[PDB]
Design a protein around this ligand. Structure first.
Ligand SMILES: CC(C)(COP(=O)(O)OP(=O)(O)OC[C@H]1O[C@@H](n2cnc3c(N)ncnc32)[C@H](O)[C@@H]1OP(=O)(O)O)[C@@H](O)C(=O)NCCC(=O)NCCSCC(=O)NCCCNCCCCNCCCN
Ligand SMILES: CC(C)(COP(=O)(O)OP(=O)(O)OC[C@H]1O[C@@H](n2cnc3c(N)ncnc32)[C@H](O)[C@@H]1OP(=O)(O)O)[C@@H](O)C(=O)NCCC(=O)NCCSCC(=O)NCCCNCCCCNCCCN
Lengths: 169, 169
């Protein structure tokens, strides 16, 4: 199992979208990926980066059925807390099926931790679906706290439609 | 009741920390604000901004007991979604007790909505405590969805200590 975890470059954006679309097809809710390869380039590889990705890369031998070298990714960005400052936020990660079980996910997790030490982050935040007890227990074994269950936080969103109203109300 | 909502400047950071400490004093959970005025400056007014603040400013007429012109704030940043791209994230906002009830809060909400259109955000995410039924209903009346209730999302945290292990193991 030879792989490397490295930062994404602009040349990796096609691979990241491909994997985002495989993640979308994977996860149970049925939202569609509106995001384009150009969006990914603009938003991550333009001026101010709105996300950062780590990428899992394999050598020619282990390339996919369609000739791809990228088999996994993590997406993260930096957030802020008024009590304790800068935080690392983990948005998602995914490893392709035939490449699971070889320490990629774990190795991805290691490199995120290094991002958080480097960048002086006090915590790493992320969402886990309540129904996903294997992933919950996984993260608790690693020292995670469930802040929804401890402090009662619920995630809300106001959609573009209603923000339009409010921007003019 | 005259007031203006405006972007924060470096000269506002002392007021922001003060209001943050008043917010902490308000919150029911008891956590020490570890952030300094210097943190706020480096993190918000250095090279890369990790947060953005909107500030409520009153004329000399209604300045505070200790002689301050800043009577409320909002803290926000930009986050990312692999399906749909850039989002506006509302971290917190707070208005001083003697200045509540004059439209500042709603006017802050209004200006955040403008930020979301100017930066091309598809929605605005924030957290609400499940116990806070007045806030929940307030936000619903404005078209907010509860994504924890609908999709089962829970907020997780792995804090500095365990990230330390993972980054070195
Ligand atoms: C789980 C994997 C990532 C694991 O990677 P690898 O196979 O390389 O792992 P290792 O070889 O190191 O294995 C080590 C062992 O530990 C367990 N192991 C290792 N890692 C794990 C994890 N992570 N979980 C459970 N078990 C693990 C694993 O089961 C092993 O155990 P063994 O018994 O030894 O075999 C992968 O299988 C994969 O990609 N799976 C598909 C995705 C998935 O199911 N879960 C991803 C949850 S992480 C996601 C996360 O943290 N935040 C994202 C949520 C945020 N969303 C918000 C939605 C909002 C946006 N949306 C809007 C649009 C609407 N639509
Ligand atoms: C609520 C106010 C902001 C209101 O602003 P104003 O007074 O200017 O309001 P208006 O004059 O415009 O409008 C008046 C009417 O609208 C209602 N009106 C207006 N707004 C509201 C709201 N929001 N709710 C209810 N009613 C409202 C209000 O009840 C009135 O009603 P009438 O019947 O018309 O008279 C203010 O009172 C205030 O700052 N209060 C203190 C803070 C507070 O209680 N809530 C803030 C919730 S927003 C927070 C938010 O979105 N995410 C924060 C969660 C993130 N946490 C993550 C944890 C991370 C930190 N981890 C460290 C460890 C912690 N230890």
């Amino acid at each position: 199992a030879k792989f490397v975890i490295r930062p994404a470059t602009a040349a990796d954006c096609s691979d990241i979208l491909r994997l985002i679309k495989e993640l979308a097809k994977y996860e149970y809710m049925e939202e569609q990926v509106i995001l384009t390869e150009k969006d990914l380039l603009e938003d991550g590889f333009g001026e101010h980066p709105f996300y950062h990705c780590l990428v899992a890369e394999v050598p020619k031998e282990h390339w996919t059925p369609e000739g791809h070298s990228i088999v996994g990714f993590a997406m993260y960005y930096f957030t802020y807390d008024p009590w304790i400052g800068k935080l690392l936020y983990l948005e998602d990660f995914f490893v392709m099926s035939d490449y699971r079980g070889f320490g990629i996910g774990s190795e991805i997790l290691k490199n995120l931790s290094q991002v958080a030490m480097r960048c002086r982050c006090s915590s790493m935040h992320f969402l886990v679906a309540e129904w996903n007890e294997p992933s919950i227990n996984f993260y608790k074994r690693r020292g995670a706290s469930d802040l929804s269950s401890e402090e009662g936080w619920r995630l809300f969103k106001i959609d573009k439609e209603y923000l339009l109203k409010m921007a003019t109300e």
